[PDB]
RNA sequence: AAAUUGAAGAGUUUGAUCAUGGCUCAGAUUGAACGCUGGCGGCAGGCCUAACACAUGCAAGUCGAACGGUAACAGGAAGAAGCUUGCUUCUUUGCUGACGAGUGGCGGACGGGUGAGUAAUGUCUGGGAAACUGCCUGAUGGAGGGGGAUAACUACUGGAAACGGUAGCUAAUACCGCAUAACGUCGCAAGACCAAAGAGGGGGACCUUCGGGCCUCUUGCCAUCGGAUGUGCCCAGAUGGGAUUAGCUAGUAGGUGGGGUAACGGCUCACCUAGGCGACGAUCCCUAGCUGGUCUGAGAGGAUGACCAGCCACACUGGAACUGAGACACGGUCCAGACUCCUACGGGAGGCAGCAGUGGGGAAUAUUGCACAAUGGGCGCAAGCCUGAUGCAGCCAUGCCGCGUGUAUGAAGAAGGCCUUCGGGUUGUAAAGUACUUUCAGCGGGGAGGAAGGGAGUAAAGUUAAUACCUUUGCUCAUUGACGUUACCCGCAGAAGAAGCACCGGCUAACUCCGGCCAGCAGCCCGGUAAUACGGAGGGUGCAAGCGUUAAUCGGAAUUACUGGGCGUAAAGCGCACGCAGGCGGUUUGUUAAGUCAGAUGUGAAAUCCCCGGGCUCAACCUGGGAACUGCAUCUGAUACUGG
């Protein structure tokens, strides 16, 4: 129910950085990003339509660390909700608890953010929530527990996040080690190199 | 029977069967008397047998042996049959 | 006779009773005549767990319907709170 | 004011009874065509008032025999 | 406010093309099975086949406030003591707390199981009249006075047993008359007729024949008319296939009369009439429980009817009735049959398609568990007893959902493995090393909620002649949990206990090396000596506590085309015509309002589906409200079109 193997292999296969490493270096200094994994990585074959759709879906999944059953249920709920299916899907993906904890700055990677959440080190409205897929609603307050504020993991993650960009829908205080989920991000707030319509066409065929 | 209540119910049921059989045979005899008086064409004997039959029929209908509807049916049928003679 | 009782719906270890008017011979969760409320015994006191209509309950009691002991206690507490 | 039917008498050979055919216009549940459907009823006709072909008005009542549960109300058109 | 916002193609006939046409695939889904593998939890599901046969335990009892009672244990008791005189230990007493057996009342027709039969004696929808209805409930009345029995018991006695027989005794709210008798039954009427039962709590005095009568309250009893509920009955429409089944029917269709039922009715009988059903599929044959619903589909449809809920049928096979308000009765009765068992050989006993379980069949489906603590049920004034319903637990990855099997750093990129143009590349930050963390599992400590009640006390009110008893209402006290070591929380230790399956020629994401049309693969179109198709290795791809294969349904399949196809040559115009049933029908006026349309009412069970919220840490799941249930009937109108 988790991917534990090599991380940079996924970003090499997707041809794009998936932020699977903290950021102490550039990925170019740790692996051949422009080369696909394996013995036959130098070749690049012409992808089919199904190939491109599958590769975009896998890129999104590996970005958010979501397996196929949960992602299929996410698409089902997004197609159930009113509006455009793609932005609904991306909003449902961004609402996760481990995703927010990573974006909040308490995790260097979404894997260590998921470890922080699962290990009962993250609180939501004063209630310790240890579900990574926990849907965070607007106005929710996310904070590190008193016992886990002493970890150097959170400090390094805070620093690494300060060297990153700041999301518009997160009001975080690094001193109190707490943040607020103000609102769901609109389509224009997430990455622009993610084609949601490819996933919609892949799941609607 | 396997249950104690089933055995007691069988005993009570056969006792009540015998009691009800005696009562029903009495009522049937007293109605057959009226029917035979109807056959004979004797209107005085018919009314006598009807007057003897009515009380026990009402009583067995009241005691739960037969329904009030059955008693009313017997009374009405025999009355209409007696009125067809005199 | 006709009785007003609870039908234990809900999940395991989290019961949810529906106050139903039913002929007392049917099963608990079986055939009933009319549902006159509900009762959530594990309510968080933040929400409502006692929404049993007293109008139809009184109408049925006026017709000889019997009230079970739990429903009688529920009616007493609903009258006291309201 | 009483709920009733109307049909034509197709048989009167029996005594005190007639057979009335109630024709109805029903749409086919699949192909949408309006097809004719016939409902033949054993109707109680006391006085033997109805002949073959009369358009009669009938109503439902208690069972009067094994197959008769409808009775006659009046005759509208009389076999001509 | 929301609650139809919904529709994808590909491979394969040919040297090639277009068309036709079938086969196959990509999607969902399952009561699944098998193979490899397998950490935890929540919620659900779990004999689809042999309605095959069943060992064993339990699944329906309850009331002493109906009754005679006392056999058992607990007490009171009068009288006799071992005697270590305050332990008193046995002789007799229903005196009472209770209670075995027995009569009696209620319940065993509910609850639970299965889908054999049933193609309409059923189910669904919508109507109807000729009916009954225990317990619950409203109103009005009555509740008087007697008798004969009988179980238990006693004595004798027959049987291996099962179970009886005879004689005597006793009780009742058991049974039977009498009186009474109407807004009840019969009858137009006059009139005639029909019922009952007590028990319990307490008590001021008056009167007691020392049991108590007398007062009050509760409860029970009988009669009638209603309510509610349940059930019985009738009609219309709908509800599989076959014409290689076209005629069927004698109680058959109807009528009069008798009987019968709670009730209408050929329900039954006598007689009379000669009908009735059928091409709109009667009759016959095969299959089949029906529905809300479930799966699939854009929809229309197709398939289906496990769990949950309603209805029906069945209870070893066939038949039958008895009791009862209700049965022709799973754990009742009688008979017959098959089978199994006990036997003293004369006779007996039994029916898991109740809960576990066994043998068998099968590819395949679980424990001979805990508790009545909650809900419901039976009985009881109540306490309470019973409850394999039910609440839970055990087993199974069977499904859905959630979480974990670590995280960060980590190179000239170690070793080995594989490939190599022998330069190197890849496995690969992957590992090792370093720093950190401890969800879940393991050990220990705290700890909700499911719990309402019930009991004992007092106080108030009502009732009453009564400041008793009883009912209701406040408060006080001591308690009521199978789950259970609960959920949840806290502490400890250590990466420590936790990743596999399928695939890589195209469809279809994923490529190289090595070993001869053989071995083998294959869902549809490879292998005859450098095979991306066989087998192994490296690498990669997709899923992931699962992964594949098989079986099955729908989709794609517009491939049964109503929505939505065709027939010159691809499958398809009868050889031609006349013509009954049927289908359709020029044009105008009037009328009707059957089709059609509009509005309203009733109904369309709950659950499920969908929408907005709520509670479980999230989800699954549970749940509030709404929408929906596209249908049917009735009533009132419209008159353009179809019909008369």
PDB file of C-alpha atoms (C1' of nucleotides) in Angstrom, chain B residues 1-17 19-21 23-24 26 35 50-51 54-56 58-60 62-65 67-81 83-84, chain E residues 60-61 100-108 131-133 163 174-178 184-189 191-196 222-225 257-263 322-325 329 331-333 350-351:
ATOM      1  CA  UNK B   1     -44.331 -34.955  21.406  1.00  0.00           C
ATOM      2  CA  UNK B   2     -40.984 -33.643  22.653  1.00  0.00           C
ATOM      3  CA  UNK B   3     -42.006 -30.528  24.617  1.00  0.00           C
ATOM      4  CA  UNK B   4     -43.955 -30.828  27.864  1.00  0.00           C
ATOM      5  CA  UNK B   5     -46.383 -28.127  26.740  1.00  0.00           C
ATOM      6  CA  UNK B   6     -47.014 -30.138  23.570  1.00  0.00           C
ATOM      7  CA  UNK B   7     -47.983 -33.206  25.609  1.00  0.00           C
ATOM      8  CA  UNK B   8     -50.316 -31.258  27.889  1.00  0.00           C
ATOM      9  CA  UNK B   9     -51.794 -29.573  24.815  1.00  0.00           C
ATOM     10  CA  UNK B  10     -52.440 -32.958  23.199  1.00  0.00           C
ATOM     11  CA  UNK B  11     -54.189 -34.204  26.346  1.00  0.00           C
ATOM     12  CA  UNK B  12     -56.315 -31.058  26.655  1.00  0.00           C
ATOM     13  CA  UNK B  13     -57.053 -31.119  22.924  1.00  0.00           C
ATOM     14  CA  UNK B  14     -58.402 -34.667  22.963  1.00  0.00           C
ATOM     15  CA  UNK B  15     -60.479 -33.945  26.073  1.00  0.00           C
ATOM     16  CA  UNK B  16     -61.943 -30.849  24.414  1.00  0.00           C
ATOM     17  CA  UNK B  17     -62.466 -32.865  21.224  1.00  0.00           C
ATOM     18  CA  UNK B  19     -66.569 -32.646  24.895  1.00  0.00           C
ATOM     19  CA  UNK B  20     -67.174 -30.712  21.668  1.00  0.00           C
ATOM     20  CA  UNK B  21     -68.153 -33.907  19.847  1.00  0.00           C
ATOM     21  CA  UNK B  23     -72.171 -31.109  22.291  1.00  0.00           C
ATOM     22  CA  UNK B  24     -72.158 -31.021  18.483  1.00  0.00           C
ATOM     23  CA  UNK B  26     -76.622 -33.139  20.624  1.00  0.00           C
ATOM     24  CA  UNK B  35     -85.813 -31.202   9.693  1.00  0.00           C
ATOM     25  CA  UNK B  50     -87.905 -25.489  16.673  1.00  0.00           C
ATOM     26  CA  UNK B  51     -88.752 -24.252  20.172  1.00  0.00           C
ATOM     27  CA  UNK B  54     -83.455 -22.697  19.529  1.00  0.00           C
ATOM     28  CA  UNK B  55     -82.179 -22.463  23.151  1.00  0.00           C
ATOM     29  CA  UNK B  56     -79.475 -25.128  22.911  1.00  0.00           C
ATOM     30  CA  UNK B  58     -78.033 -20.194  21.065  1.00  0.00           C
ATOM     31  CA  UNK B  59     -76.237 -21.708  24.062  1.00  0.00           C
ATOM     32  CA  UNK B  60     -73.675 -23.618  21.999  1.00  0.00           C
ATOM     33  CA  UNK B  62     -72.545 -18.525  23.100  1.00  0.00           C
ATOM     34  CA  UNK B  63     -70.250 -21.178  24.602  1.00  0.00           C
ATOM     35  CA  UNK B  64     -67.942 -21.032  21.573  1.00  0.00           C
ATOM     36  CA  UNK B  65     -68.838 -24.373  19.990  1.00  0.00           C
ATOM     37  CA  UNK B  67     -70.363 -19.173  15.637  1.00  0.00           C
ATOM     38  CA  UNK B  68     -73.303 -16.839  16.175  1.00  0.00           C
ATOM     39  CA  UNK B  69     -73.541 -16.675  12.381  1.00  0.00           C
ATOM     40  CA  UNK B  70     -74.080 -20.443  12.203  1.00  0.00           C
ATOM     41  CA  UNK B  71     -76.792 -20.300  14.871  1.00  0.00           C
ATOM     42  CA  UNK B  72     -78.497 -17.479  12.972  1.00  0.00           C
ATOM     43  CA  UNK B  73     -78.242 -19.488   9.745  1.00  0.00           C
ATOM     44  CA  UNK B  74     -79.874 -22.529  11.350  1.00  0.00           C
ATOM     45  CA  UNK B  75     -82.643 -20.458  12.936  1.00  0.00           C
ATOM     46  CA  UNK B  76     -83.399 -18.526   9.741  1.00  0.00           C
ATOM     47  CA  UNK B  77     -83.341 -21.594   7.484  1.00  0.00           C
ATOM     48  CA  UNK B  78     -85.634 -23.622   9.728  1.00  0.00           C
ATOM     49  CA  UNK B  79     -87.968 -20.653  10.257  1.00  0.00           C
ATOM     50  CA  UNK B  80     -88.288 -20.065   6.509  1.00  0.00           C
ATOM     51  CA  UNK B  81     -88.886 -23.787   5.997  1.00  0.00           C
ATOM     52  CA  UNK B  83     -93.293 -20.831   7.239  1.00  0.00           C
ATOM     53  CA  UNK B  84     -93.584 -22.688   3.917  1.00  0.00           C
TER      54      UNK B  84
ATOM     55  C1'   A E  60     -41.074 -22.537  24.066  1.00  0.00           C
ATOM     56  C1'   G E  61     -42.208 -21.659  27.970  1.00  0.00           C
ATOM     57  C1'   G E 100     -41.481 -30.979  41.863  1.00  0.00           C
ATOM     58  C1'   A E 101     -45.566 -33.458  39.914  1.00  0.00           C
ATOM     59  C1'   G E 102     -51.106 -32.325  38.723  1.00  0.00           C
ATOM     60  C1'   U E 103     -55.833 -29.648  37.157  1.00  0.00           C
ATOM     61  C1'   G E 104     -56.500 -24.607  34.916  1.00  0.00           C
ATOM     62  C1'   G E 105     -55.118 -19.817  31.912  1.00  0.00           C
ATOM     63  C1'   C E 106     -52.157 -17.718  28.126  1.00  0.00           C
ATOM     64  C1'   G E 107     -48.332 -18.780  24.742  1.00  0.00           C
ATOM     65  C1'   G E 108     -46.568 -23.173  21.317  1.00  0.00           C
ATOM     66  C1'   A E 131     -66.741 -11.464   6.361  1.00  0.00           C
ATOM     67  C1'   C E 132     -64.220 -13.010  11.016  1.00  0.00           C
ATOM     68  C1'   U E 133     -60.574 -10.920  14.422  1.00  0.00           C
ATOM     69  C1'   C E 163     -47.241 -46.474  28.650  1.00  0.00           C
ATOM     70  C1'   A E 174     -62.200 -26.552  34.726  1.00  0.00           C
ATOM     71  C1'   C E 175     -67.572 -28.360  33.390  1.00  0.00           C
ATOM     72  C1'   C E 176     -73.158 -28.119  33.381  1.00  0.00           C
ATOM     73  C1'   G E 177     -78.261 -26.445  34.148  1.00  0.00           C
ATOM     74  C1'   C E 178     -81.489 -22.519  36.649  1.00  0.00           C
ATOM     75  C1'   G E 184     -77.807  -8.894  20.759  1.00  0.00           C
ATOM     76  C1'   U E 185     -80.048 -13.590  17.413  1.00  0.00           C
ATOM     77  C1'   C E 186     -84.680 -15.486  14.667  1.00  0.00           C
ATOM     78  C1'   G E 187     -89.183 -13.127  13.004  1.00  0.00           C
ATOM     79  C1'   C E 188     -92.561  -7.961   8.945  1.00  0.00           C
ATOM     80  C1'   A E 189     -94.853  -8.283  13.719  1.00  0.00           C
ATOM     81  C1'   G E 191     -93.132 -12.810  20.779  1.00  0.00           C
ATOM     82  C1'   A E 192     -89.305 -16.718  21.526  1.00  0.00           C
ATOM     83  C1'   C E 193     -84.178 -17.305  23.022  1.00  0.00           C
ATOM     84  C1'   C E 194     -78.896 -16.828  24.657  1.00  0.00           C
ATOM     85  C1'   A E 195     -73.748 -15.252  29.526  1.00  0.00           C
ATOM     86  C1'   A E 196     -70.696 -14.752  33.464  1.00  0.00           C
ATOM     87  C1'   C E 222     -69.879 -11.906  30.781  1.00  0.00           C
ATOM     88  C1'   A E 223     -73.168  -9.120  26.679  1.00  0.00           C
ATOM     89  C1'   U E 224     -73.566  -5.468  22.774  1.00  0.00           C
ATOM     90  C1'   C E 225     -71.964  -1.532  19.571  1.00  0.00           C
ATOM     91  C1'   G E 257     -84.211 -24.901  -4.740  1.00  0.00           C
ATOM     92  C1'   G E 258     -81.804 -27.743  -0.240  1.00  0.00           C
ATOM     93  C1'   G E 259     -77.317 -27.827   2.392  1.00  0.00           C
ATOM     94  C1'   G E 260     -72.541 -25.657   3.806  1.00  0.00           C
ATOM     95  C1'   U E 261     -68.873 -21.524   5.304  1.00  0.00           C
ATOM     96  C1'   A E 262     -67.063 -16.384   9.654  1.00  0.00           C
ATOM     97  C1'   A E 263     -68.192 -14.711   4.633  1.00  0.00           C
ATOM     98  C1'   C E 322     -58.725 -32.025  16.236  1.00  0.00           C
ATOM     99  C1'   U E 323     -57.930 -27.827  19.587  1.00  0.00           C
ATOM    100  C1'   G E 324     -58.052 -22.874  18.873  1.00  0.00           C
ATOM    101  C1'   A E 325     -59.521 -15.968  17.598  1.00  0.00           C
ATOM    102  C1'   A E 329     -49.802 -27.014  12.799  1.00  0.00           C
ATOM    103  C1'   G E 331     -39.492 -28.699  17.443  1.00  0.00           C
ATOM    104  C1'   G E 332     -48.618 -31.053  17.984  1.00  0.00           C
ATOM    105  C1'   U E 333     -52.282 -35.504  16.760  1.00  0.00           C
ATOM    106  C1'   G E 350     -37.686 -40.627  15.574  1.00  0.00           C
ATOM    107  C1'   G E 351     -37.840 -36.732  11.630  1.00  0.00           C
TER     108        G E 351
END
